[PDB]
Design a binder for this molecule. Structure first.
Ligand SMILES: [Cl-]
Ligand SMILES: [Zn+2]
Length: 233
């Protein structure tokens, strides 16, 4: 996690929970947001981020976009009140086919709960596949990057966008790769299906002219000092 200079850093959170893996505590989460704001970081909307990275609106200074991956209930139960009380926008990348279910041991937000967050004007929902968030340990890569799977990826993506449109009544501009990475083949499928931004877990400071690709910092105990130092600097 190497971060220097003015530009857009995009944070990737998953769960806001007290005892789980890939989770940050409610208290710690709020303290992180507070610290960033305290030292002068500007929190940006997904639309602002797109116009910034596309250099279509113009700059300046130190920018941050908050994002969450998967659809965990804790985003509604614990993250959302923190965000709402601070009026901080965020992008929620959901596994559209796992919404309203238990997924890998965790309750997911329901559609009612996602809708309520969208209604606040703070939450924009993106797609995190429909139901292709699976890892192949034999091949050491995600199922959607396995050979001969480009068709399956295209169909899943189209299903995901259709599903979000049906529930939220909105075209889906934003996509996040499960496990953080794609190929030129999958990038192109996303482009032709109308996505304006494609988010990865490449930890970098994003600058105007980087669109459509956005590097995100996965927030961990080890990566936070780097973001905080970058912010304070
Ligand atoms: Cl929860
Ligand atoms: Zn994920």
């Amino acid at each position: 996690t190497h971060l220097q200079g003015d530009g857009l850093v995009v944070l990737c959170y998953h769960r806001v929970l007290p005892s789980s893996r890939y989770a940050i505590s409610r208290r710690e989460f709020a303290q992180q947001l507070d610290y960033l704001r305290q030292v002068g970081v500007r929190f940006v909307t997904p639309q602002e981020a797109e116009d910034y990275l596309a250099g279509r609106i113009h700059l300046p200074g130190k920018l941050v976009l908050v994002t969450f991956d998967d659809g965990d209930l804790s985003v509604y139960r614990h993250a959302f009140p923190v965000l709402k009380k601070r009026k901080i926008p965020f992008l929620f990348f959901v596994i559209a086919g796992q919404v309203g279910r238990k997924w890998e041991g965790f309750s997911m937000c329901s559609w009612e709960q996602i809708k309520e967050m969208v209604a606040s004007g703070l939450c924009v929902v993106g797609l995190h596949t429909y139901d292709l968030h699976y890892w192949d340990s034999q091949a050491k890569k995600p199922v959607f990057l396995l050979p001969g799977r480009e068709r399956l990826f295209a169909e899943d993506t189209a299903r995901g966008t259709a599903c979000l449109k049906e529930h939220l009544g909105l075209k889906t501009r934003y996509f996040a790769y499960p496990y953080g990475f794609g190929t030129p083949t999958t990038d192109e499928i996303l482009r032709t299906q109308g996505f304006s931004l494609v988010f990865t877990l490449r930890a970098k400071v994003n600058r105007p002219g980087d669109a459509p690709f956005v590097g995100r910092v996965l927030v961990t105990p080890d990566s936070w000092p780097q973001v905080a130092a970058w912010a304070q600097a």
